[PDB]
Symmetry: C7
Subunit: 276 residues, 7 copies
DNA sequence: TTTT
């Protein structure tokens, strides 16, 4: 090893690369401009920063996970400032239930029940929370129903896969089980491309009846029974008004820290009871 | 950080990048030539200046807004030099009404009523004021009716969207509500492109009857009732002559400063009364 | 600002860039070879030179005008050496009339009457004077009737637009009014291109009857009446022989200086009287 | 030779290149981050690192083999920590039999019987062990049934060829004998490409009846008799549950070391007896 | 100006650029190899020499003419060594007539009679003299009858134009008058290209009857009468044998010097008399 | 000449370039890694090494031959270690016959009889020896029957041409005589390519009846009689078992040295007698 | 001029460029490797050597000829070592006849009789001597009958044009006279290319009856009579055996030196007598 | 001094 000087400063940037998780450039711009000031004061190129960016991305994709980037660092422990807790307490969820549920879902604790399905009206606000969690995660995957043979356009070996609204065709439904039960299987991509899907945590953002899988023009129900043993049904009948979103990263980080500080056992149950 | 010397001068340019808002090069040329003289005396290239330009553009697109670039810095407070005030006083608008109206429209204060619609004859001069405001804004969006499936050709994640003359087809009309009510929705761009439209302030520059939405060959009226609760009708029957335009940036900056110095509450009303 | 040494020499070149107005390279070659000698003695490349050229072009297109490059610097004041004055005195034009006419036409003094139309036989020599004035102007525009939907091929945001022989089709005739009356309007270019035409001084070089606008196969006359209030008719019945041209820049510069030294008021009149 | 100082370090990297066997970049990123730190601290480029990588790959492909990268370096000799030994003891395999079997299969000791075929249910877990062994080997080959005339898409002069599920067509079946008996033959690749297949150890990962070669639509049996004299039948009727995989490299390295420490003669027999 | 050292040597090359007139590279190679030796001893590249070459070419095309490169520098004044004088004395031409004729033709003295037409048999040798004069001229053009709408393939804004054998079509015949009489005429080229041809010296090398203009399939004679007032008929009935050519540059230079040393007036006459 | 220092080390590499004959890179990798270590310690590039490689290749193709790279350097002289001698003594070949035969065939001593044809069963092992000799030769040519008009795909001006199994068509048969008798002729390559074939030593590796030339669908025999006067028939009826190959370079080098140490005259005879 | 140090060594290379005449690289490789050793020891590049090569090629093509590169430098004067003299003495040619014949043919002494035609059987060996002379000449031209409108594919302004076997079409016959009589004419190349053919020495290598010009399908004889006055018929009825060729450069150089040392007059005669 |  040589160990120069300016390159050592890059090591400090590595800390930032493990501070909030930055993959592209929008999050790096939204973070702070002091990093850009230091980069402009140092060298005005594009080789070393691009190399560091791709190295950090490969490291986060081959070693780092998602919950490791969700553990809070500031011991706040304030349930009053947590605005998303009001939604859980209004929908009828126990404060020491869904917390450990998504803790085990993110850390791959249950193994088989690695899916959380949300049910309710579209006027609630679950889409905003899902988008906020996807933005806070450096490697997020959004299933955009655009192609007939490639629904996972953005899900390119990410950490959390988000299933948008829409029914899937009977061609890889059983393969979706490997993505809905925390298993590893080999799927077919575009043309001359075959990548293995790692057991990644997947949350269904479809507010409609996801159990009614419509096979193009016919609604099927033969896959509803097994899916009840691999996912988690989180239904709610509470409607939200305006000014009840704009969730960032500090709130969810403090919530994750508070949930990790109090470990609560979770039993195997699909239909979540309306208690607490 | 290294903190050299020459690169520190770039920080001074950052001030200019937040002085009047410069994105392309025409505004930078029209500003002053001393910056170009200093750049030619320093280093004769195109890498560092292009990097600074794209960085400032990304910063202004991901963090900065529009009213933040409209607050005046010189405390003039002179209503006689404000030539556009005569138009408002002749059309029948109160001096302490429309000012706070567009103040709340730009700063996203009302939230829902984030649209200002202008009505009247085409021989007035609202198009000149709209073009001047678009030129003063570094990220302006003009809806040019050129494509059948892409009307927002210039509206590429800008700050203010300007709706030109022409009726929209019944394919994304309800989606236009998300752009006319200050909401966030996912629209379809060209081919294999899907970008989310942020709640940006939109002003309709169509002097004709915008409520009569013509669906290609038939005029519809089912969307006129809800649009009255999300926009602002600003009608006028006063005709202007010649030599009553060429509005620049100092006049609108002083007007914005004077409007911010006197905060006046605005009630929810679509049809603006002819008083003041 | 660093302020080196060799780059400071570029500032001296800026003086040349505002000495006679050079946009391309033919005028720079026809000027003097000492500039090329100094450039070859300095640096032998094509980066600093091309950057300076495009910067000067953008500056002259976005700030500088045409009459600012026509004011003479040497106080000659000699009416005997002015050979083009004989043509004006033979056609029946007052020496203190057409001078102030084109002075106000170039400096945009009248505002509305910003067009000078020349009438007479084709054997006079107005085309040579027009070509000389276009060559002396750094940003000249020649309307070459080549395309059916793009007559202004060379008029790419220049200073003076020259209308050659030929009638226009009834598709943008009224738009031509904005170019014949000193107004600003948005026209359609080729494919996916829309540029606004600035109020630029336009002189019609068509020696034939320009009032008889032929709409392809039919001669129209509904636009002749308004055009009499926006242009200037300069007819002449004097025929010129040989050796009465080769007008350069010093002669027209001295003529402009002499016309500016004696300001004479000009009344609104289309048909120029044959007096003086 | 020059022998500088910065180039000497690369020699140390050569040790890593012969430590665990790294060909691409995923394995290098999964190893340690200290090598990347040292690389970033030294020189930030991509011309020397790529050179060393391709040189090491060519060296390992033209000289090094597979068992040479499987010999353990730490004398552990612990049969309790070896979790894959439980599978062999449950299937009915002697601890001092299959060990020497795959030792001779990897080191090319038998010469003719250079193939190990596994038989049993698909719910056992042989695919996980095969994938682990392929990942530990720097040059692994997976036969992916994708093309009709190119089944060995990944087998590009590697060390171990893995035969996946699926029957082969009667076009190169006898040629497969040269790959199933440890011989050298010339095969046809894609278009205008002919490469000789070296006698490489091949293990069939097809859990189904591999002896029933289906020729598209008809099952053949004329090649089953000779294949019994070139391969090794390893059948098992024991089913495994969950949490019995995740085989790394240290486990298989210790197993190879323990098998090499005790050399046991192996007789020529296709059907492996269920003893031990 | 900087005025270095090696670049100053380029100034010496400028002398060569005005010594014999070099545009391409064949003449530069045929001149002397000392320049190439000095260039190889200096810097070995192709960025500065090409720039100097194109700059000198543009300068010679926009400022320099043809007779300025034909004036001899060595006062020889020897009529015996001039071998081309024997042809003129045998054809019946006065030694002090055709000399001043082509002197006024090259220096543009007559203005209108700027064309010299040669008539006689094809076995004389005028083509060799024409090729020699074209080779001695740096910027020369030739009309090669290859395209139907582009006869002047080589005449790309040169000094001396040559007209080979071939009758012109009735398309620009009158335009050819401007080329056969010396007049600035704006014509078109291939596709969307215009050019203003200047009064350039043109020589019709057609040894056949050029007055009989064949319009494709019909011979016309309406242009023969005016062409007698713009060209010069030089007929001859003397046939030459072998070894009476290979004219270079020194001979024609000495002839031009001797003709310039004795100025003789030339009267306006088309048919040259057979005297002297 | 400058004669630096590091470049002088390249001269040492030249020795390696004439040590074992290296053209591509596989032989250089299979040789020794000390050369690569020295190259990595010197300069990490590919401009100078590629230049040296192509220069050595051109030198070996335009000057060096094949037997010059087959003369051994170590005086071993051991007939017991020569394993290929057992094959010759079992087939019925004299130890002092075929040695001088291929010595004269390689060194072009006979001139006309420059071809050695091998006959016998395909289970002997002549293909392995042919491949070994082709690998030891830096410029080897293998005739791969792939194209209908280009059988010599690899024979691109090499040293030894190897004729594989397959009959030739009646389109270049007689031309093959120039390749089977040691003559020079001009053949036709692909498209717009004509290269002369130098008299190179050619050995036929076809174990089948090469005299029965099949012209597509008919067997011809009119070329068998002359081919008996230009080639050498080496038939054998001895079958070989396993473990009787893997011939390298030291064995054939020692055999060539021993054959050169004892020069034995060879008479002109096609059918080799079974004696010795 | 600068005249450094290492560049001065390039001047020495110029001597080599005029030593044996090298245009491409095959002759430079076949010459000596000391030049390449010195080039590799000096500077490792390809921008200065390529420039020198193309400059020397252009110089030799525009100034140097062919016989100037054929004069020997070593005064050997040995008629016994000249092996090609035996062919001339066996065919019936005087030793002091054909020598001066080709001396005048190469040095362009006769002027009109600048063609030497060889007649006789194809089994003699004139093709080998022609190829040797073409290889010794740096700029040789071989007429390859490949295209229907471009037979002179290799004859690109070379020194000696070699006419291969085949008859020419009646499309450029008379033009061939300019190439067979030592004249200058303008021919048509491919597409949009017209180059003048310089009077170059041409030797017909067609051993068949060249006088019987076959016009595609009919044999013509109207051009045989004039061709007898511009070429030289060299017929022979002596057949040669083997080992009577491999002519290099020293032999022909010594022959040219001996022929130049004894100048013998040659009379005008087509049919060469069989004497001497 | 700091490029290829």
């Amino acid at each position: 090893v040589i160990r120069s000087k300016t390159s050592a400063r890059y090591m400090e940037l590595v800390g930032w690369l493990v501070d909030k998780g930055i993959t592209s450039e929008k999050q790096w711009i939204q973070e702070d401009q002091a990093s850009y000031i230091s980069f402009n004061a140092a060298s005005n190129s594009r080789s070393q920063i691009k190399a560091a960016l791709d190295n950090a991305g490969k490291i986060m994709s081959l070693t780092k996970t998602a919950p490791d980037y969700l553990v809070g660092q500031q011991p706040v422990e304030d349930i009053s400032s947590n605005r998303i807790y009001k939604i859980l307490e209004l929908n009828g969820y126990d404060p020491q239930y869904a917390a450990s549920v998504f803790l085990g879902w993110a850390t791959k604790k249950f193994g088989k029940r690695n899916t959380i399905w949300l049910f309710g009206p579209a006027t609630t606000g679950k889409t905003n929370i899902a988008e906020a969690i996807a933005h806070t995660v450096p490697f997020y995957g959004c299933v955009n129903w655009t192609n007939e043979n490639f629904p996972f356009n953005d899900c390119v070996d990410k950490m959390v896969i988000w299933w948008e609204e829409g029914k899937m065709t009977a061609k890889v439904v059983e393969s979706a089980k490997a993505i809905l039960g925390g298993s590893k299987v080999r799927v077919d991509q575009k043309c001359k491309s075959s990548a293995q899907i790692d057991p990644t945590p997947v949350i269904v953002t479809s507010n409609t009846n996801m159990c009614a899988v419509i096979d193009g023009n016919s609604t099927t129900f033969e896959h509803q029974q097994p899916l009840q043993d691999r996912m988690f049904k989180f239904e709610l009948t509470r409607r939200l008004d305006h000014d009840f979103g704009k969730v960032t990263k500090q709130e969810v980080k403090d919530f994750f820290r508070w949930a990790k500080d109090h470990v609560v056992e979770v039993e195997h149950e699909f239909y979540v009871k309306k208690g607490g």
